[PDB]
Amino acid sequence: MARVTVQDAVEKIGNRFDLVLVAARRARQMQVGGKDPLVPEENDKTTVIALREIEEGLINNQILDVRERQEQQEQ
Amino acid sequence: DDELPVYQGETTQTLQDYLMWQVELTPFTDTDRAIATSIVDAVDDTGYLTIQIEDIVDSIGDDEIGLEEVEAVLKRIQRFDPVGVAAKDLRDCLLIQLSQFAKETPWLEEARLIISDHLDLLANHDFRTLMRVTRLKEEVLKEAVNLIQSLDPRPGQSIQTSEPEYVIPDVLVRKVSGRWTVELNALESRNDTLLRVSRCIVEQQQAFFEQGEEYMKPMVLADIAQAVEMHESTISRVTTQKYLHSPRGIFELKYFFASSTAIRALVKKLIAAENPAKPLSDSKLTSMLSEQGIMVARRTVAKYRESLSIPPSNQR
Amino acid sequence: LLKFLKAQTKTEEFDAIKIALASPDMIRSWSFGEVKKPETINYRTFKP
Amino acid sequence: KSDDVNGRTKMYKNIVDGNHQMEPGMPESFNVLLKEIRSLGINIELED
Amino acid sequence: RQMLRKATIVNAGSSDFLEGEQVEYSRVKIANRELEANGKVGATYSRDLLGITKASLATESFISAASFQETTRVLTEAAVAGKRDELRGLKENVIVGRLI
Amino acid sequence: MGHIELASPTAHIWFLKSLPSRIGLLLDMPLRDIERVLYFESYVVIEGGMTNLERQQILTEEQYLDALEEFGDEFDAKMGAEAIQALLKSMDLEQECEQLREELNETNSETKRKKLTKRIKLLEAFVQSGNKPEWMILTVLPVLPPDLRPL
DNA sequence: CAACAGCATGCGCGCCCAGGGCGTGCAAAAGTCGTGCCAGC
DNA sequence: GCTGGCACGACTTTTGCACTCGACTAAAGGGGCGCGCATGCTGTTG
């Protein structure tokens, strides 16, 4: 599911410069390791996976913070 | 400065550079990378020599770290790009190069492991008794040996010596009537005059040593120091820096200033018929030299004929 | 005894590059020893 | 991808491994400049 | 807007008597001076027009503006004065190699 | 790096000929003065105690030698750059700053109200800075690392 | 006849490649050829 | 018992070391420009 336009994920988080930070911090997880995608993979690279999960509203700064606190508390 | 192609550099890659590049990219641990970096510097532009193993182990300063750890790692390093790399002794070189024959090579795998692993020390001369050792006969062993002789040695494929390091000559010796005549082909002005005087001393050397004669007539630096009255070290420095050029046997002339060289020519003549006897007889040649009037008595003059990678001693 | 790290010695994190005059003493703090002769590389030995 | 030497290596090794992460360092050519200004009697040093 | 940096100070009390100062720093020092119980610490200033090459060369960070135009001059003012860069703009960050 | 030790400390032309001249305006001298007397030419009366030439000033070197013979007394003048080092060494910014403040009050000309402020903001920079002015003319010259001068 | 203000001349910035192109003794110390001695086959 | 390698000696080769200034007679280049800042000489105000 190639993304031509990011606007839909930019409405989710204002200022795309923020999007890029969150997108890549989320994609890094799946890229290097120790995460699995919240969305069905369409064969696409991990970057698009991340932007899709942001466009779906499943992932954001707050959500990644809550997941970080949950993973640190569970460890 | 910049914006021009200043001779900033090329950054070429040698063999050790490339091996280290190859280590960077392989799944070594923190320690194993230290052993690997420890081995790749031990390697030489010639490949095979990884020098002493137990100094590789002891160089790390104990604290555990056995021999086996450097041995395994060592093997894997020996497996990198230029096929057989490092190892030791050429034997294990040919066993690592022989490690990959695809195993689909007819007759080669087994026979090659026997010949290359053990008894290869006797394969130098010829087959002979070895044919009775391995029970092989005819061309079965000869084809395996064709493969062993088809292997090549170590690395020297990385190389990175495109520079031939040419001579560029300095002074040309135009050959005259069975001899040589100078022409000099190809403060700072005072240095140039000194170089011209060095060329003049080479011309005096033409008068000092006969060209046509075997080797060169024996001369002393006191002759060239007699002609222009220059100091010995200065003349030897001019002849050491610059290299004289002649149509035949051109050389820095530093060796041109008939002595041992004539004996070397005589040794070369003896070498031509020396093929019949592998051991050779420089001592007998020394007796012949004494009969000729040289008075050589198993001296290094004969020993030089018996040295210089001569068949003498090595054949014995 | 080894575990020898050239790459790890400089991670140096800085701010504000600073600038000033160099005293002869600070020059000599940088100095590895003195160059006393003009010539560069011997033309025979091909070593410095 | 130009003058960071340790960082070019780490970069390419992580790429071959699928990391896509940078580990940026300090580019050579800055270091050079600092030596070339030290070559006049000016020190320029990086203060933490 | 960037030509209007660099005001010129009529009155005392803020130190810096009668010379080219940042308008920013002057408005910050006068703001802090009015915040203090002493209101005479504030001074009147006059803004200056600069003129865009003058205004580059006059930048607080000695690393930029060295690399703009005049390098000898720049580095001599900086070497004698002993100024620190702070790395706060985009060219410095580039030349050091860090994010902007 | 490397370094080389200089017999007679000289030059550093980076200062002095980068206009304006810090050595010129620091010592209250024209750059034709100091520029002229760096190498050869004048003898640059330095200290000049018990000397007919003003403790600070220059003179014709041949005339100065004749003047010294006429004086019958010897004045520690330095023809080389060592007089700039000596003068430069004997200069105190705080004493100069007090003199400059008196001079600024003394001056009735705005033209004179600018130069003075230049010297205040300069010398003041040397005080708060912590650099010694001496350092400007250099003794030990550092040499650049070999690999960045390739052959 | 005093210092002060103005006009003018000179010098150093920029732009920008651009192409390479390159002897004079004597004397103390040491490298090497010669010769002999010792070890290997 | 013979050959080859190496050790000891002689020789003959290598190396010490540098100051004066030496100079030397030309060898040429060579159509922008602005802009500004400072030094210097002139000029007019009292």
PDB file of C-alpha atoms (C1' of nucleotides) in Angstrom, chain G:
ATOM      1  C1'  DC G   1      47.963  81.414  14.192  1.00  0.00           C
ATOM      2  C1'  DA G   2      45.034  77.442  16.636  1.00  0.00           C
ATOM      3  C1'  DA G   3      42.640  73.012  16.148  1.00  0.00           C
ATOM      4  C1'  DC G   4      38.863  70.853  13.632  1.00  0.00           C
ATOM      5  C1'  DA G   5      36.175  69.168   9.584  1.00  0.00           C
ATOM      6  C1'  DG G   6      36.076  67.840   4.787  1.00  0.00           C
ATOM      7  C1'  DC G   7      37.763  66.077   0.116  1.00  0.00           C
ATOM      8  C1'  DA G   8      40.685  62.983  -2.050  1.00  0.00           C
ATOM      9  C1'  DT G   9      43.993  59.332  -3.162  1.00  0.00           C
ATOM     10  C1'  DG G  10      45.536  54.748  -2.176  1.00  0.00           C
ATOM     11  C1'  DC G  11      44.932  50.143  -0.641  1.00  0.00           C
ATOM     12  C1'  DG G  12      42.360  45.856   0.063  1.00  0.00           C
ATOM     13  C1'  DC G  13      38.000  43.356  -0.448  1.00  0.00           C
ATOM     14  C1'  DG G  14      34.699  40.786  -3.780  1.00  0.00           C
ATOM     15  C1'  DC G  15      34.027  37.384  -9.052  1.00  0.00           C
ATOM     16  C1'  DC G  16      36.693  33.422 -10.961  1.00  0.00           C
ATOM     17  C1'  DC G  17      39.054  29.815 -12.540  1.00  0.00           C
ATOM     18  C1'  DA G  18      43.522  28.047 -14.391  1.00  0.00           C
ATOM     19  C1'  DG G  19      46.368  25.404 -15.357  1.00  0.00           C
ATOM     20  C1'  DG G  20      49.185  23.091 -14.638  1.00  0.00           C
ATOM     21  C1'  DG G  21      54.351  21.811 -13.738  1.00  0.00           C
ATOM     22  C1'  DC G  22      57.954  20.647 -11.532  1.00  0.00           C
ATOM     23  C1'  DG G  23      85.532  21.770  -4.585  1.00  0.00           C
ATOM     24  C1'  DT G  24      89.654  20.530  -0.708  1.00  0.00           C
ATOM     25  C1'  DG G  25      92.245  18.594   2.142  1.00  0.00           C
ATOM     26  C1'  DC G  26      93.036  15.305   5.883  1.00  0.00           C
ATOM     27  C1'  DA G  27      91.403  11.736   9.087  1.00  0.00           C
ATOM     28  C1'  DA G  28      88.518   8.460  11.952  1.00  0.00           C
ATOM     29  C1'  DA G  29      85.015   4.950  11.191  1.00  0.00           C
ATOM     30  C1'  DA G  30      82.588   1.321   8.526  1.00  0.00           C
ATOM     31  C1'  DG G  31      80.948  -1.959   4.208  1.00  0.00           C
ATOM     32  C1'  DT G  32      82.619  -5.420   1.715  1.00  0.00           C
ATOM     33  C1'  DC G  33      85.763  -8.703  -0.761  1.00  0.00           C
ATOM     34  C1'  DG G  34      89.159 -12.062   0.404  1.00  0.00           C
ATOM     35  C1'  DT G  35      90.900 -15.838   3.044  1.00  0.00           C
ATOM     36  C1'  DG G  36      90.748 -19.178   6.406  1.00  0.00           C
ATOM     37  C1'  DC G  37      88.323 -22.069   9.795  1.00  0.00           C
ATOM     38  C1'  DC G  38      84.588 -25.157  11.162  1.00  0.00           C
ATOM     39  C1'  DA G  39      80.569 -28.030  10.339  1.00  0.00           C
ATOM     40  C1'  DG G  40      77.481 -30.903   7.367  1.00  0.00           C
ATOM     41  C1'  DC G  41      77.044 -34.902   4.047  1.00  0.00           C
TER      42       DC G  41
END
